[model samples]
Target: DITVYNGQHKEAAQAVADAFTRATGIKVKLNSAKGDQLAGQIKEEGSRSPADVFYSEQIPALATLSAANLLEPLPASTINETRGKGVPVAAKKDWVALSGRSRVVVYDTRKLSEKDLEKSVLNYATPKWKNRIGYVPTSGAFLEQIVAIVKLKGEAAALKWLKGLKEYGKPYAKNSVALQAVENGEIDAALINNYYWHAFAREKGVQNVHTRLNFVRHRDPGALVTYSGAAVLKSSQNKDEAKKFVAFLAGKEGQRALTAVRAEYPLNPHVVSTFNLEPIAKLEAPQVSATTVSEKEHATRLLEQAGMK
Candidate 1:
């Protein structure tokens, strides 16, 4: 028997776990919860943790464990077999990213034309957008964006940008609130993941949405691509079985499972999507790997110093 600690949607994780069990004849003991919370549990449990694998909903949680030296360094061949040879999605070669999402600026269509959209996310802090930008400073997704900029442009620049956002932007408690504020014309635009708009359009019908998604192109920080990652813990007694599960997640069949079940972009380059998403290859997303995007605490500190709460 193998154990899986999953942070992806419970139903989707269950489907994948069932598929793994059937394909390999290894019974799975699955535990599902929010990504950070589960990661926190693993950290608390440490080398004594019973979990064999960590299926994270976001990169930072995996990165945290990796930083603490809790994750096994996966074989390069396992990553090569699935995501392709020489793709640098892993940091310290300790974890692998299974799926991804691109950062997008969702703007109110009623208030702003396509031409009025900022070319880069940094432009949101300008006087032109004063009181018009909506933000969720505490969200993991937004914090990842902060991490991207800090790495690309330097901490001084990031600190200045956060200051500008605090001075000129509106902070919402959540992404949905930020998106809804844009929809209601309360704010001109908000930064969010690409999936939210698509999910909303599917939920309430596209014709009723006042907000439209715009991607920041040319490898801008706002264009950062982030991922849901997975890794086998070094503490696992079932190393081979855990590796098999990680391989399965990055493999074509498993990637396809996620595509169909969650509408997320599969990281395996060969997997074709059935969903109506912008081609992941043409996304012009920042080249930052998910491992490097784990600058969570740095972003948190900056945002807090700026009084973003």
Candidate 2:
């Protein structure tokens, strides 16, 4: 038996867990919560933590544990299957990416065309987009984007951009709400994960969706591709089983289950997404390391300083 601290969506995580159980006969006990919440618990528990695995929707939480040295490095054989397959790994090999999503501009077709949108996300922070852009300053993904900006540019540039966003961009409570605002023509465009638009398109039928996604190319920070990842805890009693489970997540079977349940892109090269999304390689996403993006606290503080909090 293995215990999993799951921060991925419940349905998607359960699907993979069930499949893993059926294949290995390893019973799984899942404790589901927000990624940050689970990361916090693991940090607090330290060596006494009962969690065998930490599965997350984004890399920061997993990166947080890796930074704390609370995570065990995954075996090379277990993660090699995803190499060069669009799946990214921790610099320290403490975690393995399971899936991916690109940050994109979700624009209302009636209000703006792809050509009308700014080529880079940083450009949206200027006065030309004032009162025309929407964002979720409170979203974890948004914070991750800020981290990418800080890495690619500098803290001063990132802070200036955040201040610009706070000055020019309208705030929404959630990604879905921001997408709807775009579709309803309430906003010209929004900064969001590709999966949000894909999920909405699937729900309403693609043709009925009034908005379209714009991928910022040329390794732009706006085109930063984020990932869902899994890790083994250093304190796990079931290390072997946990490793097997983590491997399964980066394998074809697990990727299939995950993509079928959610709109995220599969990290496994052998598995293809059911949704019509731009290819990962073509996104030209900036190469910001997950370790750098894991500095969520710093990003949050900057947001507050920029008056986004």
Candidate 3:
């Protein structure tokens, strides 16, 4: 039996967990949540914890465990085998990314022409975009972007961006709300993960989606992309089964399991998302290393200090 803590979408996590069990006859007990709580539980329980797997919606939670040396280092072959052709993996090989999403600016299609847009994500932080951009400051997606900026540009720069956002931005509690504000013309644009736009489109029917996603093709923090990751706990007795399960997550069948509900991209090199979204290869996302962007704790402090939290 393998004890699993799943932190991404519940249905997708259960689907992949179910698929792994069906194939290997390994009994899986899954605990699902938003990630931080689960990570904390595992940490408190320490080696006595029964959890064999930690699958997360974002890398930071997993990174927290890795920083504490709570996870086992996966085999290099497993890391290379499961990752997308160019997807970055954690430097320590402590985890493997299972799927991906990129940062994008969503805008009111009726408000701005294509030519009126700026090329970098930072352009929206300027004086012109004041009071016209909606965002979720404390969202994991936004927090992780600040993490990326801190990694790429330094803490000073990240703080500057956060302070600027607080001064110029409208706060929303969720990504969907931000997208709605953009569509309703309450705001000109928003910073959000790529998946939310598609979800809104699917929810309202694509034809009714007044907001459009804009991809910035530069090595800018705004173009940062993130991956959901899974790792095995070092204390697990079911080491072999856990590794097998991790491999499956980065494999064809494992990725296919998520297609039913969520539109996240598969990490498998051979797979392209069936979601009809933009080609991942062309997103030209900044090459932020997996390990580098996991410095989210520090980013959070900077955000709070900047009065954005």
Residue 167 Cα positional deviation in candidate 3, in Å, after optimal superposition: 3.9
Cα lDDT of model 2 by residue, 165-252, tens digit: 8889999999989999999889899999888888888889988888999998898889888888899999999999999999999888
Please provide TM-scores, in order, for all candidate models, with all chains considered together. Answer: 0.85, 0.89, 0.87
Model 3, range 91-127, lDDT digits (tens) per residue?
A: 7899988777888888888887567777876667667
What's model 2's TM-score?
A: 0.89
- Candidate 1 global CA lDDT score: 0.81
Cα shift from native, residue 245, model 1 (Å): 1.7
Residue 269, model 2, lDDT: 75
Candidate 1 vs candidate 3: the lDDT winner is 1
Using lDDT, give the best candidate's number: 2
Ten contiguous residues minimizing lDDT sum, candidate 2: 288-297
Ranking by TM-score: 2, 3, 1
Question: In model 3, which range of ten residues has the least summed lDDT?
Answer: 288-297
TM-score of 1: 0.85
Give candidate 1 regions above 4 Å deviation: 22-25, 43-48, 67-70, 73-75, 81-87, 289-295
Between prediction 2 and prediction 3, the one with superior lDDT is: 2
